[PDB]
Design a protein around this ligand. Structure first.
Ligand SMILES: CCCCCCCCCCCCCCCC(=O)O
Length: 277
């Protein structure tokens, strides 16, 4: 059987893509005021931003171990080889929980080939890795080689972003007129710089990309935004002007991530080592 690719809502890939490429989907949980929702399935970013915009503190949770097991079980039974590219273990306990679920399943279904990669990635940084996995899988790339390659790919992904207010991230717990510029280091969020006004952080984001990027023109640059396509499209131009990039993938930030980053969040993703896949 062909390798089945699995991912969670931390990847920020549009459901149109998930469904098209038959990607098993594990929704992260979004909740507040007694109601639980499933990221990308029963809740949309606007509903979250709107809630926060109304003085609400939208919270998130890991999917349940039961939910995880229900998702993998079918594959274990038909004994189909799987690759689950998980949201950064430093941003959620989802990964570890899934490894636990994996052991349980192995006990019942030995021979079940399920590899879980702790991506150390978030949003489209993770999504880009998932899309590459889909490509390698449809090319019938050998299982181990495919898994090893996607892990190396994840190890070279950069996540450079800005939010409107660090309070959201702070109250969210993933971090302890100035706009902040942050980045993802080994799976964790690290506040990096402080700039006056939006225009400058965007200019600086594109600049840092040029410093860390590798063979940027040959790469598919990822850009995710918190319901602010206008700025994303703005950032896209600055990049094609400055770096001469031609391949882009823009998408909205998911609800779970959005509940932490907050409105006005803009991020770019690229490899610091051009792995040619
Ligand atoms: C445009 C996005 C750039 C990357 C931004 C990462 C922001 C940190 C997001 C943390 C989301 C936390 C999800 C927690 C899920 C859970 O409750 O286990």
């Amino acid at each position: 059987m062909p390798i089945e690719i699995i991912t969670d809502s931390g990847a920020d890939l549009p459901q149109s893509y998930i469904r098209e490429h038959r990607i098993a989907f594990l929704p992260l949980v979004v909740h507040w005021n007694g109601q639980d929702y499933k990221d990308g399935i029963t809740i949309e970013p606007k509903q979250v931003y709107d809630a926060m915009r109304q003085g609400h503190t939208v919270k998130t949770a890991q999917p349940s171990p039961l939910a995880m097991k229900e998702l993998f079980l079918p594959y274990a039974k038909e004994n189909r080889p799987c690759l689950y590219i998980a949201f950064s273990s430093k941003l959620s306990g989802t990964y570890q929980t899934a490894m636990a679920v994996r052991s349980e399943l192995l006990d019942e279904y030995p021979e079940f080939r399920l590899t879980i990669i702790d991506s150390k990635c978030a949003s489209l940084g993770q999504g880009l890795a998932v899309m590459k996995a889909v490509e390698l899988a449809k090319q019938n790339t050998p299982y181990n080689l495919l898994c090893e390659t996607i892990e190396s790919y994840c190890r070279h992904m950069e996540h450079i972003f800005t939010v409107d207010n660090l309070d959201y991230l702070a109250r969210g717990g993933r971090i302890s007129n100035i706009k902040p510029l942050l980045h993802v280091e080994d799976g964790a969020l690290i506040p990096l710089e402080k700039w006056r006004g939006r225009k400058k952080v965007l200019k600086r984001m594109v600049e840092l990309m040029g410093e860390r990027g590798d063979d940027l023109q040959k790469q598919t640059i990822g850009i995710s935004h918190a319901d602010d396509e206008e700025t994303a499209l703005e950032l896209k131009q600055m990049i094609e002007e400055t770096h001469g990039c031609t391949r882009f993938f823009l998408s909205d930030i998911g609800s779970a991530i959005g509940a932490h980053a907050g409105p006005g969040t803009i991020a770019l993703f690229f490899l610091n080592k051009y792995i040619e896949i």
